[PDB]
Symmetry: C3
Subunit: 281 residues, 3 copies
């Protein structure tokens, strides 16, 4: 299934027929950070398996829903269950849900994820507003846009220099200042490690030398498909460890330590993003 | 279709039957830079679609011709319409036209492309004689030679240390000195970004740290297949922007700015390469 | 053929029925360095082609055997003929033999390979105990674990920080000290170049900047599959050139120079690894 104009139009025809919502705003929430999606009012929940041309996700399993409703009086659509390229999904499978968002009317996409810290001043539980990226898969001929260009959505050769909207980063920081947690909020460069192994101690050392502030296994593919078709993006990483410090001290990372950090910050992130949605121009 | 001895011999049998030219020299021209190929004398134009075992290019579209004729009294063969790996072509598809060149008798291959500048002293419209490369796809298990080795063409483990012939670089510089444009001519290290997104601002910063002079999305695959089977190579990048400066000043690159630079330099490059062909040993 | 619990159990059922050995220790020997495998006592030699679900290797050709027997009174299993990812084998093909080792009872895996030297103090014929790695394919979405996780073998997101067991590195160094060749033994960080082209002069310069001590085209995939399923690992590189020096002096590497270094050190490595096996806790 190619992520082309006709296959995405077929999916959007089904969603509109079921939901009766035309959303302006899309959200993709990171693992353990999706509590906001249960707070959506006047909801329709749509399993991916019921939507024409949506990718099959029965191998990886776990939740896979599109949720449409209202937050702060705004009309939104959420992916509940994010598709990760380390699972083996092709370029076409990742791109189609984003391109369906576009046809549904999404103009702004808000994204959260979990990441490892590389910059020395970053601590467990800090947040990082992403302002640029280093796309190791893209340099290495695994860019999410490798393949024929779908000209109806965007250009063959996109410019990523404003892929992370500066006015959205400012709005996010203003909201944290209003609530006296700006001291947790940083800006930084995100490195895309295809994964699924955690960054090794010597990979982490390397990324420091190359000026990365955080590293993770998601987000860059969705950002590129969104930028290709003219959707503005805000992306926020929650730091779950300092990998540079682990490397210098011979300490281990693991999934259980990571998920506990998400639990610790989930409710603050929920409230932050609720107010961001309410206050988007 | 594997790029093996028999499939390439089948294609070469067809070309020789149609053209009545045995070329010594191959040329692959970059986008907007192929005007020289219309100046070829006593031509035969052969669409790729008519050549047995040549890769299908009807998805990407646009021109796809092999052109055989005479320049400066020398017998040449040109690819009019270059195959790019960001389109989704496999290793076998890229390699076969080069290996057919070899069976047709090509001993020297001359290549031009468009690239972004990373070295601070490089400006829009400068030329760069490539003297080595950093092959991010190759480090990342997308080398154009991944797969079984075709032993008839070359070794399992090639040495790339003289892939860019030093005497051809000297000849090119001598010709520019004769015409008083040597001040436009540099030498440099080319980084292969698989693409198709332009290098991001923070990717550009990274490449500076790693000692790259230019970056682009082509040329390294063809160079490796040519070196594998013993064809000498000259490769010249036309600089269409300084990406380090764009990053420091928060400026955008785009395809329309890039194509205008090609237009500005096309005729000088045409004349340069005409005299290079005439004067190859 | 997926490298899942049932397909690997089917292979292990066949091996046990033929060999009557339950090994504790696995070995994977590098090119020209497998002489120890002929010294295995009370052997069974099993061609890969006869084992259910083992990957087909008739395209690459050359030896492909599993050998089970006794060394120093210990029960072992060896791969005679290593699978390399530059040949075009998928993730599943590489992983299955290691996962069969696990089901057969392997608790420790010992690995040797040939590599290029990047650290300036390393010379032709030196050995390097690997203590960490930089996995360019993994950063670039070609990690050997990309695809669905096989939960029976290990976790979705493994930690690689103790993938190279520290007590095994110490035991190896102690043995070299006992035999007065500790002056040949170093420790270092290994860069995985997917290959099959040798590291270029400017790739080598880059790797120095990023803190790599050696570079090669194997070993990291097997280490990751082993670590995933809880097998301890010792990995030793034999240095066959200094690629930083070749780059500064404009000198060439080649396969014939490399194989002669293996010949020069094969017998010392054979005896070293024999005593390591004998003395594993
Ligand atoms: O803490 C952490 N989370 C996700 C990562 F990919 C790496 N490190
Ligand atoms: O100016 C420019 N041309 C091609 C590139 F790949 C990047 N930058
Ligand atoms: O000497 C050497 N051996 C293997 C390599 F991959 C590179 N260099």
């Amino acid at each position: 299934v190619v992520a082309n104009y006709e296959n995405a139009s077929m999916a959007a025809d089904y969603i509109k027929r079921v939901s009766n919502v035309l959303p302006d705003i899309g959200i993709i929430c990171g693992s353990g950070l999706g509590k906001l999606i249960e707070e959506i009012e006047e909801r329709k929940v749509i399993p991916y398996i019921n939507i024409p041309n949506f990718p099959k996700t029965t191998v990886a399993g776990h939740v896979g829903n599109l949720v449409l409703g209202s937050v702060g009086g705004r009309k939104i659509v959420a992916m509940q269950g994010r598709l990760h390229m380390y699972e083996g999904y092709s370029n076409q499978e990742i791109a189609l849900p984003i391109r369906v968002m576009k046809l549904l009317g999404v103009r702004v996409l808000l994204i959260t994820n979990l990441a490892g810290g590389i910059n020395r001043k970053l601590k467990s539980g800090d947040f990082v507003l992403i302002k640029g990226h280093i796309n190791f898969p893209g340099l290495g001929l695994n860019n999410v846009l490798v393949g024929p260009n779908q000209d109806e959505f965007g250009p063959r050769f996109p410019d990523l220099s404003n892929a992370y909207d500066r006015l959205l980063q400012q709005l996010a920081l203003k909201i944290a200042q209003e609530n006296d947690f700006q001291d947790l909020v940083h800006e930084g460069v995100y490195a895309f490690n295809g994964g699924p192994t955690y960054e090794s101690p010597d990979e982490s050392n390397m990324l420091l030398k190359l000026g990365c502030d955080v590293v993770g296994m998601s987000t860059v593919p969705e950002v590129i498909i969104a930028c290709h078709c003219g959707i503005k993006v805000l992306a926020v990483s929650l730091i779950a460890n300092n990998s540079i410090l682990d490397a210098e001290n011979d300490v281990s990372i693991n999934h259980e330590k990571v998920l506990a950090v998400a639990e610790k910050r989930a409710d603050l992130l929920q409230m932050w993003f609720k107010e961001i949605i309410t206050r988007l121009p």
